[PDB]
């Protein structure tokens, strides 16, 4: 906030439906929301609706609390304007396609990728925040729904915006992309397939390849070097001027130092060469900044600028934070986990000082492996030089299980209620020690409040 103001006029147009009983708006419109518990005087609620509910039952209640506007598929016999709609979530959409339209001073970048995308995002707002009033997309809001109501925060003086869109599956990324209408688009990487998810990585692939369909006029195409689908993913970005990313391609990284917290390499790119001192850690953050790197370019911005860009920009929350709370240290890297992920920050916790102890959660979704999954894991993980590993949630049982040989390092637990004196009592169980904690676990398990409620402590 604050937002640009919306007339009737303007919802209208863009949405092209019909004020009910000619009830016109008299007043600007200072929002669009979908949250009936927040519209209020000023705003205009759009009523959603889909698998088993419907927010026009709630339009009573925006009108109780003063709204006096509301965007529905069908009248209500209520006191409020209201502009009638076929589809809201088709509407949603046209809203966000106009503003985004209207807004022709925009460079615009939407990008995806299995991995990596909130963390590139990050970066590329870094760098161009630097330069101008830059959007970027807010949390999670990358979806059919989520995009358009990003696009909605749209303001005159932004003069780039970067757009994550998080769909796998087909026609997705072409609905959400053809909306964004970007001058540089392009795909991270593509990961691995759902147990049974049809298409499998192959349909990853096509689907995230539809983001190169709207590429606007003399834009570029930014695509993965380094990934087992470059080649497809080549071929379905051949209709635009393509830039890459990764080793072999146009930008990449050299002489990489993995550091406790950061990264250092050498950058390589099609305008000059530079040194980077990338304050993230791992290489996967490596890779992300090359991939932020070659977008950058992409929209015409300096190396100089991007290197700066690169040197001040910060993580998103639980993505490898790193907080130091007296000797001891708080790296919150509770967004998500997977397999992988979480063997991986393991490592991370290593790099560090004194006392490591890995406090992790539920990998959830690993749908009937979840017991043989955190079995392997605590046992892996116990067989590393780890001091502690705290593993709370309803497989934890199945980690301490699989230990083995390392049951007396791994404490497994049912809820951080009962974890945490674990954790407290663990503190002066080393005396005035350093020690290193780092909360794991996927986003079910807000791991992030376990580790705030040892913090507060
Ligand atoms: N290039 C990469 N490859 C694989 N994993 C990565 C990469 N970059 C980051 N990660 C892993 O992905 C996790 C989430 O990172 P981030 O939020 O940038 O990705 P995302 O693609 O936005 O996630 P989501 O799919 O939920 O939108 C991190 O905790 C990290 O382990
Ligand atoms: O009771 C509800 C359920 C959903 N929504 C809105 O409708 C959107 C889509 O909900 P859906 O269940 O279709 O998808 P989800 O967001 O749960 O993935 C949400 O983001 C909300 O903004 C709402 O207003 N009330
Ligand atoms: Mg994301």
Redesign the pocket.
């Known amino acids: 906030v604050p937002l640009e103001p919306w007339t009737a006029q303007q919802l209208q147009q863009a949405t092209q439906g019909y004020w009910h009983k000619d009830q016109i708006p008299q007043t600007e419109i200072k929002r669009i929301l979908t949250d009936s518990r927040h519209a209020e005087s000023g705003d205009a609620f759009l009523a959603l609706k889909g698998e088993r509910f419907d927010a026009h039952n709630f339009v009573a209640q925006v009108v109780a609390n003063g709204c006096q506007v509301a965007i529905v598929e069908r009248p209500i016999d209520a006191e409020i304007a209201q502009l009638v709609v076929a589809d809201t979530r088709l509407a949603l959409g046209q809203l966000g396609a106009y503003r985004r339209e209207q807004n022709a001073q925009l460079k615009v970048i939407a990008l995806?990728?299995?991995?990596?995308?909130?963390?590139?995002?990050?970066m590329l707002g870094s760098i161009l925040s630097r330069l101008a009033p830059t959007l970027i997309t807010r949390g999670?809001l990358?979806n059919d729904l989520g995009v358009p109501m990003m696009l909605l925060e749209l303001r005159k003086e932004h003069q780039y915006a970067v757009m994550?869109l998080?769909a796998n599956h087909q026609g997705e990324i072409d609905y959400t992309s053809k909306i964004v209408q970007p001058h540089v688009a392009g795909i991270?990487?593509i990961?691995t397939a759902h147990l049974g998810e049809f298409g499998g990585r192959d349909g990853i692939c096509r689907a995230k390849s539809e983001i190169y369909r709207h590429i606007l006029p003399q834009g570029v195409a930014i695509v993965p070097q380094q990934d087992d689908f470059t080649a497809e993913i080549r071929e379905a970005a051949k209709s635009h001027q393509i830039m890459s990313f990764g080793e072999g391609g146009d930008v990449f990284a050299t002489e990489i130092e993995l550091l406790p917290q950061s990264a250092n390499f050498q950058l390589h790119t099609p305008q000059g060469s530079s040194f980077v001192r990338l304050p993230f850690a791992?290489e996967?953050?490596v890779?992300?900044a090359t991939?932020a790197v070659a977008f950058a370019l992409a929209l015409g911005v300096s190396l100089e600028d991007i290197v700066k860009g690169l040197e001040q920009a910060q993580?998103?929350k639980?993505?490898?934070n790193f907080i130091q709370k007296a000797p001891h240290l708080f790296i919150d890297?509770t967004?998500?986990?997977?397999p992988?992920?979480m063997r991986?920050?393991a490592q991370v916790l290593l790099q560090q000082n004194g006392i490591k102890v890995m406090v992790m959660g539920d990998i959830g979704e690993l749908g009937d492996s979840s017991w043989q999954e955190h079995h392997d894991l605590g046992r892996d993980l116990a067989e590393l030089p780890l001091d502690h590993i705290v593993a709370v949630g309803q497989f934890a049982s199945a980690a301490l299980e699989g230990a083995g040989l390392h049951s007396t390092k791994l404490k497994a637990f049912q809820t951080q209620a009962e974890a945490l004196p674990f954790l407290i009592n663990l503190i002066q169980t080393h005396q005035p020690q350093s020690m290193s904690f780092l909360f794991?676990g996927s986003?079910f398990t807000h791991m992030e409040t376990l580790m705030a409620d040892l913090m507060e402590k």
């Open positions: 995806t990728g299995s991995s990596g995308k909130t963390t590139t995002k990050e999670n990358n994550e998080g991270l990487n990961g791992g996967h953050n890779q992300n991939a993580g998103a639980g993505r490898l890297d967004y998500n986990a997977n992988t992920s991986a920050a794991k986003r």
